[PDB]
Amino acid sequence: MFADRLFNAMERNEPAPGMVLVAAPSMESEDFARSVILIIEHSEYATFGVNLASRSDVAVFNVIPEWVPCVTKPQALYIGGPLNQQSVVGVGVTAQGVDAARVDNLTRLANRLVMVNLGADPEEIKPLVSGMRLFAGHAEWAPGQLAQEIENGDWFVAPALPSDVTAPGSVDVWGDVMRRQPMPLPLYSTFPV
């Protein structure tokens, strides 16, 4: 859904870092079906995001073991998207006390969500985050293309929460995000099966 008519009285949230793009129920492509894509960069150059909804079977230990102590369970790489799947992004939730504007190795997305520079010392970062997840690959939108897709009803733009990034592996991330949205969106949400 996410037809234009949904927004006659209610206004669309604008894409920005820290928003999630929630896949329309009707999206069928294997790479994007039931995805929840956290926007991590939104610029004149392009929009970049990582899917939060798709865990892989690759343990973080086998790729960057040094980061394992900072990673929220399950400590597996999540599949961020179809591009550059050998490249890894860290998304963290800042700990109490932390302002990402004053920590060079953290980049504020919105609220407590940050991109963690994986070149940092994990021992530096550990006290500064309450949770973190690693994503292999990403999704990209050319300039203007995300807007076009939103207008077509492909995505619903919603604020991300820390729990979207730190969710246990038993969770239906797409379903949980749909349940937070205005009616009628919860009517199309799903539970783990």
160: nearest Cα among 84, 53, 68, 55: 53
Tell me if 157 sits within 8 A of 18, measured CB to CB: no
* Domain count of the fold of the chain: 1
118: nearest Cα among 89, 75, 78, 76: 89
Residue with tokens 């900072």: 70
Per DSSP, the three-state class of 157 is strand
Residue with tokens 């969770």: 171
- Cα 11 from chain centre: 22
Produce one character per residue of 90-113: b if its CB has 16 or more CB atoms within 10 Å, e if not. Answer: bbbbbeeebebeebebbbbbeebb
Q: Which residues pair with 23 in a beta bridge?
A: 155
CATH of the domain at 64: 3.40.1740.10
Q: Which domain holds residue 79?
A: 2-189
Q: How many angstroms is the resolution?
A: 1.5
